[PDB]
Amino acid sequence: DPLLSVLMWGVNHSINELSHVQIPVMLMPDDFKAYSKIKVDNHLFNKENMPSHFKFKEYCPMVFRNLRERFGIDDQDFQNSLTRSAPLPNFHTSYDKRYIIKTITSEDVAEMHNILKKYHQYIVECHGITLLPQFLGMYRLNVDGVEIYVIVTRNVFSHRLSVYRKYDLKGSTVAREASDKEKAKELPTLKDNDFINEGQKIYIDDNSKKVFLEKLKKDVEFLAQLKLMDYSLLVGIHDVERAEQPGEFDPNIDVYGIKCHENSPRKEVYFMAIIDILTHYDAKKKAAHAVNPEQYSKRFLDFIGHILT
Amino acid sequence: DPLLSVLMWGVNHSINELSHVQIPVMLMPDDFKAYSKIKVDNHLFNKENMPSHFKFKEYCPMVFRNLRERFGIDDQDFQNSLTRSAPLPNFHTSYDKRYIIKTITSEDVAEMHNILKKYHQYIVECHGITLLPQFLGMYRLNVDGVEIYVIVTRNVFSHRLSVYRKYDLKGSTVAREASDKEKAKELPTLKDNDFINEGQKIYIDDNSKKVFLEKLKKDVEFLAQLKLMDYSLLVGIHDVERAEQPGEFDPNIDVYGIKCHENSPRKEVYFMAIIDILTHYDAKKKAAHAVNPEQYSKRFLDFIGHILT
CATH class of the missing domain: 3.30.800.10 (Phosphatidylinositol Phosphate Kinase II Beta)
Structure with a gap:
């Protein structure tokens, strides 16, 4: 303060x-x-x-x-x-x-x-x-x-459009799930196992998904060069109907927004981006004393590809 | 700079x-x-x-x-x-x-x-x-x-009206005159002997002069209480005719201005005020090692009274 x-x-x-x-x-x-x-x-x-x-x-x-x-x-x-x-x-x-x-x-x-x-x-x-x-x-x-x-x-999320569901994704073969305690929060930060076991679909059209994945590929490759790791894909979902109880946004303020495609079962806008990149490989090993950078890269890009499938 | x-x-x-x-x-x-x-x-x-x-x-x-x-x-x-x-x-x-x-x-x-x-x-x-x-x-x-x-x-002087003649007055019984070198400047700071020998008149009306002198009296008495001395009356003269080659001023910006009276031989506006008061009595004695405060007070107020006569 x-x-x-x-x-x-x-x-x-x-x-x-x-x-x-x-x-x-x-x-x-x-x-x-x-x-x-x-x-x-x-x-x-x-x-x-x-x-x-x-x-x-x-x-x-x-x-x-x-x-x-x-x-x-x-x-x-x-x-x-x-x-x-x-x-x-x-x-x-x-x-x-x-x-x-x-x-x-x-x-x-x-x-x-x-x-x-x-x-x-x-x-x-x-x-x-x-x-x-x-x-x-x-x-x-x-x-x-x-x-x-x-x-x-x-901000990854919109300045106007409220996010009703948020995911923190890593692709780690390790057990990544939100806690029974954490899942009790109002905006739980759900994790890989949450998303995967709970059948989350991201309904974006194929051109949006190819563009996104190509961006992601170049971004994560760049992070891997720097021997950085432990970063997440942050996924926010804005439910147009739940908000109304109109779903348009300025892609020049809300730069991470992607509208859903026209047969999505519910009017949704997605906010997705990489967060928390400053963990150098050796920073994580020191904190762990209180998973190579490329391995993280591969398991990450593979998972997000499967997410969007 | x-x-x-x-x-x-x-x-x-x-x-x-x-x-x-x-x-x-x-x-x-x-x-x-x-x-x-x-x-x-x-x-x-x-x-x-x-x-x-x-x-x-x-x-x-x-x-x-x-x-x-x-x-x-x-x-x-x-x-x-x-x-x-x-x-x-x-x-x-x-x-x-x-x-x-x-x-x-x-x-x-x-x-x-x-x-x-x-x-x-x-x-x-x-x-x-x-x-x-x-x-x-x-x-x-x-x-x-x-x-x-x-x-x-x-500023004692006007922000608009140019001063063509400036005096630095002290009332000191000591020899106070500007130098033959100093008198060669463009705005010479003339002194007591200059003013006195050169017959300078200040043509302000009697009410203006009584008000001024009463202010001056209270001001200088106050400085004397503080055992301050070596201060001057600064006198600037704005010649309306020489400027034109119209003599009005904002007494709320040019707060020290006093217009001349209506039979002044020349259209003039005077700017008068006390300057340089921070010389404590003992500050002057130390610099002199490189005239009491009341004495300065009396010789000053007497002289300015004679100035305006």
């Missing part, structure tokens, strides 16, 4: 600063090693929700400025989405449901730095058309003894 | 921050001991005219917010006056000629802190009607090894 305040203040500050830089079409190598730090000390000048001593650091501001524009996001809109009203917990969601704010470890920050240039290059090569997470900003927040790192992404 | 950039950035930052605080009608004792510090470090994120490592400190932001409003100055106007375009050297003047930006010593900063509460109280008592300097903001600027302090005041 006070950390949230710093995030809001900092994002507002960061975007206002950039609004003055002239943005070239390209990035230089040093853009990937750059950062912006502010440290505020207010003495007997106490504000409303603002802590009186805080630090705010933005990593690689020019890279993320470049990415946001490649992802179709205007800086002023981004600013408003994160500063007109506080993000809500759920990670956090921007008050307008457009962006996600996740807390990550310094280890994830190191790995994001380590892939940022290859990631950016891949985003350039696919013209921003990918099922990968859209990384929009990365920050460090300090308030009096607490340091956290946040990364901001575009 | 890079310090000027920090000043502009900082003033912009300071006013935007205050635009969010709710301003009470009163100040608390702690408001006079408060400050706001920002430290910026940009690594490989080089801006246009902005240094990439700087510090900016605002002293007592609530007191000066309070003073500005008592002096009739809106914060957004103040901001624009100091940030839409750079101040010009001459001290510095805001690009719209409304405010003055003077560089002061840390010793002056200490003395300003030391009188700020009595000063504020006096401004409250006279409803902001005074010939004293209108202190609007005080700041500390750091860029890579340089630290300076600035204090911002309302």
Whole structure:
């Protein structure tokens, strides 16, 4: 909450600063090693929700400025989405449901730095058309003894259309099922065995499915090159009828939406994308001390192919 | 210049921050001991005219917010006056000629802190009607090894009406004359002996002169209580005819203006005010090691009375 305040203040500050830089079409190598730090000390000048001593650091501001524009996001809109009203917990969601704010470890920050240039290059090569997470900003927040790192992404789900059923898919030969406890939540994050045993159909037409699967193939191959793994396909289902109790969406805001085909048994819109990619192979082995990257790649792409069948 | 950039950035930052605080009608004792510090470090994120490592400190932001409003100055106007375009050297003047930006010593900063509460109280008592300097903001600027302090005041002179002749008056029994070198400048700062030997008349009507002199009396008495001295009466003369080659002014922007009376030999507008008050008695004695406060008071008020005669 006070950390949230710093995030809001900092994002507002960061975007206002950039609004003055002239943005070239390209990035230089040093853009990937750059950062912006502010440290505020207010003495007997106490504000409303603002802590009186805080630090705010933005990593690689020019890279993320470049990415946001490649992802179709205007800086002023981004600013408003994160500063007109506080993000809500759920990670956090921007008050307008457009962006996600996740807390990550310094280890994830190191790995994001380590892939940022290859990631950016891949985003350039696919013209921003990918099922990968859209990384929009990365920050460090300090308030009096607490340091956290946040990364901001575009929401996989719609900002308007409610998701009534959500799946987290991995293709792992291991037993992946939601818990009897977890299945008691209101939006259970169901898993591979849920989907498979419960006969979930995804009714998208054949052209939509071929396009999707080809995107997925290039995306997952790219993640495999980076020796990344443990990522999921996130699947949200919006039931048009249950919402009405009309199912159109802006594919330029809800960029992961795919309408169902015309003989779907029920009017449905699907939101599908890869999430949680920053687990490097060796990060998972260290946490396991408290499944190779290609193996994950194959078992994943095979499963999603079977999902859509 | 890079310090000027920090000043502009900082003033912009300071006013935007205050635009969010709710301003009470009163100040608390702690408001006079408060400050706001920002430290910026940009690594490989080089801006246009902005240094990439700087510090900016605002002293007592609530007191000066309070003073500005008592002096009739809106914060957004103040901001624009100091940030839409750079101040010009001459001290510095805001690009719209409304405010003055003077560089002061840390010793002056200490003395300003030391009188700020009595000063504020006096401004409250006279409803902001005074010939004293209108202190609007005080700041500390750091860029890579340089630290300076600035204090911002309302310009004694008009923002529109050009001054063709300027006097610096003290009433000192000592020999006070501008130099044969100084008198070669374009706007010479003439002195007591200049004025006196050169038969300068100030043609203001008797009511204007009685009002002025009574203000001056209360102001100088107040400075004398503080054991301050070495201050001057600054006198600017705007010649309406020389400008035309029409002499009206807004007494709410040009608050020190006094129109001449209707039999003045030439259409003239006078700008008069006390300047440079922060010399404490003992500050002058230390600099002299490189005239009591009441004596200065008496010789000053007597002289200005004779000036206007």
